[PDB]
Structure 1
Amino acid sequence: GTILIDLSPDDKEFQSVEEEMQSTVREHRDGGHAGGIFNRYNILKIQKVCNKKLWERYTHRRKEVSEENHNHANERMLFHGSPFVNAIIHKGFDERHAYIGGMFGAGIYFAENSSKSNQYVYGIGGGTGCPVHKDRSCYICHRQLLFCRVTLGKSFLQFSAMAHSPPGHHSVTGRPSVNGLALAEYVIYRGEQAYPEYLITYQIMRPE
């Protein structure tokens, strides 16, 4: 049911997605171990993910959440990196896509910082790096991230350095409490609460 529509680099929509990708790169406390050493990306392609069934599954859930939270879905656009990006765009998010060992429990994790999601493209901790060169810092191989529409609803705030949501909440927010430059990360416990709206193909760039 999924079709992928290429965006032109001249399209304002390509440009706004690229800017969110580039402007939310940060340095990571692992010195680049997981995701590689880079300050910016070479964006190769941005595709719109179109699937009627998956979209309707998302909007149905979004209405349920909205109605449980004074008509406020608290919808964000967030990054997701995963070795399962191909399954996600065809079948939707579900429990197979959960980070069982995440710090907020077994749920599906999203990041404000594109570079945080980049650390998961090749697996937890960057796994063994790219398939071809086994390099977590590969500057040659093409990587993919999702830029996703995510319903947070009433989100449980965790100050910090599938399961169920905490009672009375629809998500968890991991607020950074040590690294002053880190942006928030978020967990949902229902696959229906996210839609994989853009598929971004890119390389990390070696700093000069």
Structure 2
Amino acid sequence: GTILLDLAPEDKEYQSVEEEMQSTIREHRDGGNAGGIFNRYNVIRIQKVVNKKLRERFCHRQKEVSEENHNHHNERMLFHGSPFINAIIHKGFDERHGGMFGAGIYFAENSSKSNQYVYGIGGGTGCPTHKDRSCYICHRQMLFCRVTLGKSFLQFSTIKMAHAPPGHHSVIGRPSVNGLAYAEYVIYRGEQAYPEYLITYQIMKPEAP
């Protein structure tokens, strides 16, 4: 099964994962409705997910994508937030489980974008205990994943795709809202992502203005 490797805070790998998570916080158009109000996270722990079958399935797909993309995986480290997090670390990503780019598995460069989905779409009803989307008490988890993009198809309008377009492996969707769009990285096969880092954290309440 799955083994969780515990990274130490003094490790460079722990520090780079934290830095990527802290530096990619941005303001969201919903004004903090989904993920809460914060400028920084309190990182509780960073764990490396080790699972032989998930790694085998990921290697196998990686090789296929490489062959169709002039021997390039086109791998990127991206954030993912989901109420399925526990099933992801044990069984892997599952495309069988509304998005602006069709029935895919969505990844963001912004950690704050993935934080909006910890409790489900639009932040759901928030944490189970306080029903608070901006809870500063309850521990949250998000993933920092290896994502095999291969040949990405560039999408600029909302389209309901079932699979990557012919000859392609992923979709880079930019959904325009009043002319502004942040990229969403979409895969349509769970084996095209590995849940490399499990980050346990809290959002932090900014000091009163």
Q: Residue 108 of structure 2 corresponds to which residue in structure 1? A: 111
Paired with 1:155 and 1:127, the residues of 2 have a C-alpha distance of 30
Q: Residue 203 of structure 1 corresponds to which residue in structure 2? A: 202
**TM alignment of 1:123-202, pairs within 5 A:** 123-159=120-156, 163-175=162-174, 177=176, 183-202=182-201
State the shift of 1:167 in Å: 1.5
Paired with 2:74 and 2:178, the residues of 1 have a C-alpha distance of 25
Q: Which moved more, 1:160-169 or 1:47-56?
A: 160-169
State the shift of 1:176 in Å: 5.9
Cα pair 1:160 1:178 within 8 Å, conserved: no
State the shift of 1:163 in Å: 1.5
Q: Residue 44 of structure 2 aligns to which amino acid in structure 1?
A: L
Q: Residue 6 of structure 2 corresponds to which residue in structure 1? A: 6
Q: Does 1:102 align with 2:124?
A: no
Q: Residue 63 of structure 2 corresponds to which residue in structure 1? A: 63
Cα pair 2:68 2:167 within 8 Å, conserved: no
Query: For 1:95, what is the secondary structure of its paired residue?
Result: coil
Q: Residue 87 of structure 2 aligns to which amino acid in structure 1?
A: A
Q: Residue 37 of structure 1 corresponds to which residue in structure 2? A: 37
Q: Residue 83 of structure 1 corresponds to which residue in structure 2? A: 83
Q: TM-score, normalization: structure 1?
A: 0.94
RMSD of aligned residue pairs (Cα, Å): 1.7
Paired with 1:194 and 1:148, the residues of 2 have a C-alpha distance of 6
Paired with 2:186 and 2:110, the residues of 1 have a C-alpha distance of 14
- CA distances 1:32-53 after superposition (whole Å, capped 9, x unpaired): 0000011110000000000011
Name segments (4+ residues, structure 1) moved above 6 Å. Answer: 179-182
State the shift of 1:159 in Å: 2.4
Q: TM-score, normalization: structure 2?
A: 0.93
Paired with 1:12 and 1:63, the residues of 2 have a C-alpha distance of 29
- Unmatched runs of 5 consecutive residues or more in structure 1: none
Q: Residue 172 of structure 1 aligns to which amino acid in structure 2?
A: V
- Unmatched runs of 5 consecutive residues or more in structure 2: none
Cα pair 2:100 2:175 within 8 Å, conserved: no
Query: For 1:42, what is the secondary structure of its paired residue?
Result: strand
Q: Which moved more, 1:176-185 or 1:30-39?
A: 176-185
